Amino acid sequence: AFRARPWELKKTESIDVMDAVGSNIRIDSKGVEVMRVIPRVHEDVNEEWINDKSRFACDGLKTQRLTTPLIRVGDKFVNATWDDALSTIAKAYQQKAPKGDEFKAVAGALVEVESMVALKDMTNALGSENTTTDTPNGNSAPAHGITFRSNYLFNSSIAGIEDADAILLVGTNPRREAAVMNARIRKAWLRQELEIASVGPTLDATFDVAELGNTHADLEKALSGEFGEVLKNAKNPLIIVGSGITDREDAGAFFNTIGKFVESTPSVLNENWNGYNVLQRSASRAGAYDIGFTPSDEASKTTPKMVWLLGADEVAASDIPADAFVVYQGHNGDVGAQFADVVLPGAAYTEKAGTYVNTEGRSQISRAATGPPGGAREDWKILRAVSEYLGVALPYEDAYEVRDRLAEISPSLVRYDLVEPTVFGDVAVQHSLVGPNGSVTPSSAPLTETIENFYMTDSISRSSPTMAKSSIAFNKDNKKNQAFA
C-alpha cells in the first residue's frame, strides 16, 4: 500500500515461477527487500497479464525463511554451521552405506534446472538412479515418457490457441492451472468460432465448456462419438491434458487412448499442426524431464535409506520412511523442513539467475534481484560442496561450466526465449503414449481436481499471510463471492 515509491526501486526483469507458463515479470526491490511484482510484455506467453498468486506471493519471501543451517538432535532443531551439517551428512552416508538405488532425490516445484542437474550428476555419481518428482506418483516413470519433448509439452504454442477452432479439456482446470491461458481461450472464444468440451470435474469456467463426463468411459465415448467428429473436422484442434492425469495410477490408459486418437486423426497431427498438449502446473517438471530426472523402474521399488528432497513441501510422510536420513533444501520452512534431520537454506527465484523451462519448452533465464539472505547459498554450489564432502565430486566450479554442462544435457536449455518446432511427432506418439500403455487398465475412479485451492499451492505461497487472507475470502461459501443470478 504505502511501502515505497517508484524512484527508489531497482527494476529487474525476471521470470515467474508459481506456474508452468513462465510469465515474464518486472521485480521491484528496495535493497534487500522485494516490494512488489508487476507484469512484463511477451505476446507468445503471457501478453501483459499475470495471475494473483504471482503478484501477491512476494510477501512470502520475507517471512518464515531459512537463514541458517539446522540439525535435528531429538524433537528440537539446533542451529549449526555449514561445515557441521555437511560433515553430518557425510557421516550419515558412511554409517548407513546406501547401496545403488537407496539414495533418493526429490525435486519439487520452484527449482532451477542447474540444481536438478547438479543433484542428478551427484546422485548418479553415488550409484543411484532414483531421481524422482514430488508428485504423488513421482516414484515411477511417467506414462507419457520423457523420450521426445513432444510428449510432455504444450506443443501447439500458447500463441496457437488464438488459431484454435475446437478444444478438449481432460482433467484440467485452466483457471487454476495457468489462468493466463484460460484468459487466452476466452479471448479466442469471443471473437472466433470455438467449441469446447471437457472431461473432468465440473469446473466453474470463464467460458462455455459443454461438460460431458468425469471418467475414462465418457472420454472414449466422446472422442469416438460426436466431439471426435468435431475435432476431425476442425482445422486447428487442441487436446489439452492436465498433469494430474500424469499424477494418477491409471495414466497409461488415458494417454494410450489419446495417442490412438491423435495418430488416427490427421487434423490434430500434421506437418503444420500438433494438437496434442500436456499442461504442466509447475515450472520444474519440464526442465526435469528435459534432463532426465525420471525414476528408473529398478529404483522405483527400493525403500530408500537417505532422502535428499529439494524444494519439496508436498510430500506425504509416507513417501519418506522414519529410519532414513533426510536433507531438505529450500528457502522456506512449511512442510519438508519439519520432517528433516538436516535443513540447508537455498535461495528463492528473486535471488538466483536460474533457468526455467515452461510448458511450450521455451527456456527463459532469470535475473538476480537481491542476494540470498543470511547464511543462505545458491543450490548448485551447495551440491558441489557436499559432493566434495562425500566420496565424489562434480567437474564444474563456476557458472560457465554449468552452462556448458546444460548444453551437454540438452542444447535447447541455452536457446533462451526461442521456442522450437519438432520433427518427431508421429514417432513420439507411437513410441511413448501408445506402446507401453496398452497393459494398464482404466479405473472407475472419477477424476478429481488437481488443485483444491489456487492459493496456498507451494511453500512461497503458504508462507504468505496475504494468501491466507485471500483464501479465507474469495471462497465460494462466502456471500460476497457469489451473485444471486
8 Å CB contact between 36 and 2: no
Chosen residue from 266, 421, 438, 446 binding other proteins by CB under 8 A: 421
**Positions in 269-328 near other proteins (CB under 8 A):** 290, 292, 294, 296, 298
**Smallest separation (angstroms) from other proteins to the CB of 236:** 18
Question: Nearest distance from residue 122's CB to other proteins, in Å?
Answer: 8
Q: Which stretch binds other proteins (CB under 8 A): 102-110, 173-181, 315-323, 370-378?
A: 370-378
Given candidates 359, 410, 450, 461, which one binds other proteins under the rule CB under 8 A?
A: 410
Phi, psi of 162 (to 5 degrees): -60, -35
**Which lies closer to other proteins via its Cβ, residue 6 or residue 74?**
6
Residue 371 interacting with other proteins (CB under 8 A): yes
Tell whether residue 417 is a contact of other proteins (CB under 8 A). Answer: yes
Give the integer Cα–Cα distance in Å for 417 and 283: 15
Residue of 366, 462, 339, 381 lying closest to 40 (CA atoms): 366
Q: Give Cβ neighbours of residue 28 (< 8 Å, ≥ 6 apart).
A: 4, 6, 9, 10, 11, 12, 34, 35, 36, 37, 38
- Candidates 1, 7, 43, 74; binder of other proteins (CB under 8 A) is 43
Residue from the set 22, 69, 98, 346 that interacts with other proteins by CB under 8 A: 69
- Rounded to a whole number of angstroms, the minimum distance from the CB of residue 42 to other proteins is 5
- Cα(58)–Cα(369) distance, integer angstroms: 12
By CB under 8 A, which span of 65-73, 170-178, 216-224, 467-475 interacts with other proteins? 65-73
Q: Tell me whether residue 93 or residue 189 sits nearer to other proteins (CB atom).
A: 189
Instruction: Closer to other proteins by CB, 75 or 297: give it.
Output: 297
Q: Which of 216, 248, 377, 462 binds other proteins (CB under 8 A)?
A: 377
Stretch that binds other proteins, among 23-31, 223-231, 265-273, 453-461 (CB under 8 A): 23-31
How would you list the strands of the sheet with 70-72, edge to edge?
A: 77-79, 70-72, 342-345, 325-330, 306-310, 103-107, 130-133
CB 12 to other proteins: min, Å: 9
- Binding segment for other proteins among 165-173, 279-287, 306-314, 412-420 (CB under 8 A)? 412-420
Applying CB under 8 A, the span of 36-44, 218-226, 308-316, 476-484 interacting with other proteins comes to 36-44
Terminal Cα distance for the chain, rounded = 34
Binder of other proteins out of 87, 375, 449, 471 (CB under 8 A): 375
Our CB check for other proteins shows the closer of 266 and 411 to be: 411
If binding is defined by CB under 8 A, does position 40 make contact with other proteins? yes
- Binding segment toward other proteins, per CB under 8 A, in 196-204, 261-269, 335-343, 390-398: 390-398
Q: Maximum distance among all alpha carbons in the chain?
A: 67
Per-residue binding letters, 185-214, with other proteins (x by CB under 8 A):
----xxx----------------x------
The least distance separating other proteins from the CB of residue 125, rounded to whole angstroms, comes to 4
